[PDB]
Design an enzyme around this catalytic site. Structure first.
Site, short mmCIF file in Angstrom:
data_model
loop_
_atom_site.label_atom_id
_atom_site.label_comp_id
_atom_site.label_asym_id
_atom_site.label_seq_id
_atom_site.Cartn_x
_atom_site.Cartn_y
_atom_site.Cartn_z
N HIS A 266 0.83 -1.20 0.00
CA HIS A 266 0.00 0.00 0.00
C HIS A 266 0.87 1.25 0.00
O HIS A 266 0.63 2.20 -0.77
CB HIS A 266 -0.92 -0.07 1.24
CG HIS A 266 -1.81 1.13 1.45
ND1 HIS A 266 -3.18 1.08 1.33
CD2 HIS A 266 -1.51 2.41 1.79
CE1 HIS A 266 -3.68 2.28 1.57
NE2 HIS A 266 -2.69 3.12 1.85
N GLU A 267 1.88 1.29 0.87
CA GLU A 267 2.74 2.47 0.95
C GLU A 267 3.54 2.69 -0.32
O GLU A 267 3.62 3.81 -0.83
CB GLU A 267 3.66 2.42 2.17
CG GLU A 267 2.98 2.19 3.53
CD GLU A 267 1.78 3.08 3.82
OE1 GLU A 267 1.72 4.20 3.25
OE2 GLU A 267 0.89 2.66 4.57
N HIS B 149 1.58 4.22 -3.09
CA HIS B 149 1.43 5.67 -3.08
C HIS B 149 2.50 6.34 -3.92
O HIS B 149 2.23 7.31 -4.64
CB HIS B 149 1.44 6.22 -1.65
CG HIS B 149 0.13 6.09 -0.93
ND1 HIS B 149 -1.05 6.59 -1.45
CD2 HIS B 149 -0.18 5.56 0.28
CE1 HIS B 149 -2.03 6.34 -0.59
NE2 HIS B 149 -1.52 5.74 0.48
N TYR C 111 -4.63 14.22 -2.98
CA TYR C 111 -5.01 13.44 -1.79
C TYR C 111 -6.16 14.08 -1.00
O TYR C 111 -6.05 14.34 0.18
CB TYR C 111 -3.79 13.21 -0.93
CG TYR C 111 -3.90 12.02 0.01
CD1 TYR C 111 -4.01 10.74 -0.50
CD2 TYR C 111 -3.85 12.16 1.38
CE1 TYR C 111 -4.05 9.63 0.33
CE2 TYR C 111 -3.89 11.06 2.22
CZ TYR C 111 -3.99 9.80 1.69
OH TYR C 111 -4.00 8.73 2.55
N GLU D 215 -6.33 6.21 -2.46
CA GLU D 215 -6.36 5.21 -1.39
C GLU D 215 -6.72 3.84 -1.92
O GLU D 215 -6.10 2.84 -1.55
CB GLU D 215 -7.33 5.65 -0.29
CG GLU D 215 -6.67 6.47 0.79
CD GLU D 215 -5.50 5.72 1.39
OE1 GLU D 215 -4.35 6.23 1.38
OE2 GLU D 215 -5.73 4.58 1.85
N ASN E 82 -1.38 -16.60 3.25
CA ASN E 82 -2.62 -16.18 3.87
C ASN E 82 -3.26 -14.98 3.16
O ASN E 82 -3.62 -14.00 3.81
CB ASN E 82 -2.43 -15.86 5.35
CG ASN E 82 -1.90 -17.01 6.13
OD1 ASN E 82 -2.33 -18.14 5.96
ND2 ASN E 82 -0.96 -16.73 7.00
N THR F 5 -4.85 -4.65 15.67
CA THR F 5 -5.53 -5.11 16.90
C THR F 5 -5.09 -6.52 17.30
O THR F 5 -5.85 -7.50 17.16
CB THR F 5 -7.06 -5.04 16.78
OG1 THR F 5 -7.50 -5.83 15.65
CG2 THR F 5 -7.50 -3.61 16.64
N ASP G 128 -10.49 13.50 7.51
CA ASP G 128 -9.72 12.52 6.74
C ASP G 128 -9.56 12.97 5.29
O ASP G 128 -9.72 12.19 4.35
CB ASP G 128 -10.37 11.14 6.87
CG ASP G 128 -9.64 10.02 6.14
OD1 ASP G 128 -8.38 10.02 6.12
OD2 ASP G 128 -10.31 9.11 5.62
N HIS H 168 -9.86 7.61 3.30
CA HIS H 168 -9.80 6.24 3.80
C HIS H 168 -11.18 5.62 4.05
O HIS H 168 -11.26 4.47 4.50
CB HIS H 168 -8.99 6.15 5.10
CG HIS H 168 -7.56 6.55 4.95
ND1 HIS H 168 -7.10 7.82 5.24
CD2 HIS H 168 -6.48 5.85 4.54
CE1 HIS H 168 -5.80 7.88 5.00
NE2 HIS H 168 -5.40 6.70 4.57
CA LIG Z 1 -6.75 -8.00 15.00
CA LIG Z 2 -3.69 -11.94 4.77
ZN LIG Z 3 -2.81 5.13 1.94
#
Ligand SMILES: [Ca+2]
Ligand SMILES: [Ca+2]
Ligand SMILES: [Zn+2]
Ligand SMILES: CC(C)C[C@H](NP(=O)(O)CNC(=O)OCc1ccccc1)C(=O)NC[C@@H](C)C(C)C
Ligand SMILES: [Ca+2]
Ligand SMILES: [Ca+2]
Length: 316
Positions: free
Chosen positions: A142-143, A146, A157, A166, A183, A194, A226, A231
């Site tokens: 993702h970064e 950009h 942006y 985004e 995965n 989290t 935002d 986002h």
């Molecule tokens: Ca989590």
């Molecule tokens: Ca994954």
């Molecule tokens: Zn981003």
């Protein structure tokens, strides 16, 4: 730095062992000479002055807890480089093998990662909302995406262009995650988000509404937080991309899926040949339709599915 190319070994944020390309000159540095004009990983040492110091290690073994975010930033930047080169024939973010630079251990308790105009930057997280963010391959990709956007379409942006910006980063982050094939899913940031809650993620492309993000243009956010919801409103485009690849019936509109590889080809072409800094969602639809037309023909299933997906999310 000038030195000889070496191969170190270490463990990443999630405890997995991997080999990393390093450079030896007195110390072993996180400098991978095997890709373009190099991939360089830096220690920001819990401060905010960038880039910090090129990561130096005495023995070419990277098993300390402090090393883990650096191992993953460096390794996943390599995977992302390989994706763009092997899949899209693009040499680094600028198309001319620009050196790729990342800093880890940025600030204290920092629950984010970003491209600062020149390099990637990763917080360690606070241990509650995030663990060190370079542990997510989708995050790293993702970064870096950009940077690709900034060198190509240049999407501003904020507001709709920023939500496209985004979504492009979430789309290619996910396609890189599938390319590495560990995965893989259509969720964003699940590996680093989290740690005390299993089964969640920062965003979902398959069902953006699970985390409160819109999945239809009629639910777009119109306020100022935002950067105008970049986002948040990305969910509308993420859902369209998910539908193009995987298919489904969404608000009664059925989409025939065409698969991830064709999604990536269509969106890469749109990003690099049709989108502009000010493109809105309607202009993205037109760019994606034209890109699919170029690649597959006006009467193709691929064009029809692009139209169906944008119809399903309410973008004309
Ligand atoms: Ca989590
Ligand atoms: Ca994954
Ligand atoms: Zn981003
Ligand atoms: C993929 C996830 C984990 C990271 C991703 N980071 P980002 O979108 O590159 C920020 C802004 C700026 C910074 C420097 C120069 C110019 C402009 C994100 O979604 N962050 C936002 C989440 C942490 C959440 C707060 C919406
Ligand atoms: Ca060491
Ligand atoms: Ca993911």
């Amino acid at each position: 730095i000038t030195g000889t190319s070496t191969v170190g070994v270490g463990r990443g944020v999630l405890g997995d062992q991997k080999n990393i390309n390093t450079t030896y000159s007195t110390y072993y540095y996180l400098q991978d000479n095997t890709r373009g004009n190099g991939i360089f990983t830096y220690d920001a040492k819990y401060r905010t002055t960038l880039p910090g110091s090129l990561w130096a290690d005495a023995d070419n073994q990277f098993f300390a807890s402090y090393d883990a975010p650096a191992v993953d930033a460096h390794y996943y930047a390599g995977v992302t480089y390989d994706y763009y080169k092997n899949v899209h024939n693009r040499l680094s973010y600028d198309g001319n093998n620009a050196a790729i630079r990342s800093s880890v251990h940025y600030s204290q308790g920092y629950n984010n990662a970003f491209w600062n105009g020149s390099q990637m930057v990763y917080g360690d997280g606070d241990g509650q909302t995030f663990i060190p963010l370079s542990g997510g391959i989708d995050v790293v990709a993702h970064e870096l995406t950009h940077a690709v956007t900034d060198y190509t379409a240049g999407l501003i942006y904020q507001n709709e262009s920023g939500a496209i910006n985004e979504a492009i980063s979430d789309i290619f982050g996910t396609l890189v995650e599938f390319y590495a094939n560990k995965n893989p899913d259509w969720e964003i940031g699940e590996d680093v988000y989290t740690p005390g809650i299993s089964g969640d993620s920062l965003r979902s492309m398959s069902d953006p509404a699970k985390y409160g993000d819109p999945d239809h243009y009629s639910k777009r956010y119109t306020g100022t937080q935002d950067n105008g919801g970049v986002h948040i409103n990305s969910g509308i485009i993420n859902k369209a991309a998910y539908l193009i690849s995987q298919g489904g019936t969404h608000y009664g509109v059925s989409v025939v899926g065409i698969g991830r590889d064709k999604l990536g080809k269509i969106f890469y072409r749109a990003l690099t040949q049709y989108l502009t800094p000010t493109s809105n969602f309607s202009q993205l639809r037109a760019a994606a339709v034209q890109s699919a037309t170029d690649l597959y023909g006006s009467t193709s299933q691929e064009v029809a599915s692009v139209k169906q997906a944008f119809d399903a999310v309410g973008v004309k």
